[PDB]
Paper text:
In order to understand the relationship between the structure and function of hNtaq1, we determined the crystal structure of recombinant hNtaq1 bound with the adjacent N-terminus of a symmetry-related hNtaq1 molecule at 1.5 Å resolution. Three C-terminal residues (Lys203, Asn204, and Cys205) were disordered in the crystal and could not be modeled. free values of the final refined model were 14.4% and 17.0%, respectively. hNtaq1 is a monomeric globular protein with a novel structural fold of alpha-beta-alpha three-layer sandwich architecture. The catalytic triad (Cys28, His81, and Asp97) is highly conserved among Ntaq proteins, transglutaminases, and cysteine proteases of diverse organisms. In the structure of hNtaq1, Asp97 forms hydrogen bonds with His81, Tyr111 and a water molecule 1 (water403 in PDB) and His81 interacts with another water molecule 2 (water444 in PDB) via hydrogen bond. The N-terminus of a symmetry-related monomer is anchored into the active site of hNtaq1 with the side chain of the N-terminal residue (Ser1) in close proximity of the catalytic Cys28. The surface charge of the binding cleft is predominantly negative, and several hydrophobic and aromatic residues (Val76, Ile77, Tryp78, and Tyr80) are well oriented to recognize main chain backbone of the substrate-mimicking peptide and to stabilize aliphatic part of the bound substrate-mimicking peptide. Overall, the active site bound with the substrate-mimicking peptide directly suggests possible interaction mode of hNtaq1 with substrates.
The human C8orf32 gene encodes human N-terminal glutamine amidohydrolase isoform 1 (hNtaq1). Ntaq is an initial component of the N-end rule pathway and converts N-terminal glutamine to glutamate. In the N-end rule pathway, N-terminal glutamine and asparagine are tertiary destabilizing residues and these residues are converted into secondary destabilizing N-terminal glutamate and aspartate by deamidation. The N-terminal amidohydrolases are classified into the N-terminal glutamine amidohydrolase (Ntaq) and the N-terminal asparagine amidohydrolase (Ntan), which share low amino acid sequence identity and mediate the deamidation of N-terminal glutamine and asparagine, respectively.
Author numbering: 1 to 202
Write the structure that this text describes.
């Protein structure tokens, strides 16, 4: 046996339960934005402890396991996926991924072990990078007009959310600047899988 302390075990979630959260399939960027807004609007946790995390790569083909779109027989290959990360004071980070079949929220190390998995034997073009944006900056800066979800014929790929598009004074659309894993573009910091797990893993 092996045993560590001190530790974090009565963690109260920063969000409502999964089934009470704002959610539209295939609008993870917005689902995460709405989690960030909830946290900002409540007095449980400081917003400074929370991050939006975009997962993608140059080829926009990233596997994630433990996904509701294909349970039991992962991975799902996404163009990008977005989750919320909360760094709690208890010694410990948590992932809030409304699309996971893991718990909501899930301990960071579990999510990385079971949903992300190692890149070591993954074909290099499918390896994962992580853009980590402070929640306050994500709320300040993110904008999407949803135009990436409307095909050539003007049909929606998946139904858009019913509330108005997220826009800022500076932009009506900058989604690509968050999907990008070019560290010279956009906001926040871009990490390799190893760097990401080094920063947040226990």
């Amino acid at each position: 046996s092996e045993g560590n302390g001190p530790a974090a075990v009565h963690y109260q979630p920063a969000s409502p339960p999964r089934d009470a959260c704002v959610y539209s399939s295939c609008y993870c960027e917005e689902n995460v934005w709405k989690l960030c807004e909830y946290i900002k609007n409540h007095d449980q946790y400081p917003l400074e402890e929370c991050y939006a995390v975009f997962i993608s790569n140059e080829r926009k083909m990233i596997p994630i396991w433990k996904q509701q779109a294909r349970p039991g027989d992962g991975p799902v290959i996404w163009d990008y996926h977005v989750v919320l990360l909360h760094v709690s004071s208890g010694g410990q980070s948590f992932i809030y991924d409304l699309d996971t079949v893991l718990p909501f929220p899930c301990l960071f190390d579990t999510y990385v072990e079971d949903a992300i998995k190692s890149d070591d034997d993954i074909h290099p073009q499918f390896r994962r990078k992580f853009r980590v944006i402070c929640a306050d900056s994500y709320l300040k800066n993110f904008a999407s007009d949803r135009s990436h979800m409307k095909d050539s014929s003007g049909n929606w790929r998946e139904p858009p959310p019913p509330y108005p598009c997220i826009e800022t004074g500076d932009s009506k659309m900058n989604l690509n600047d968050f999907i990008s894993m070019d560290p010279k573009v956009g906001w926040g910091a871009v990490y390799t899988l190893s760097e990401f797990t080094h920063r947040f893993g226990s």
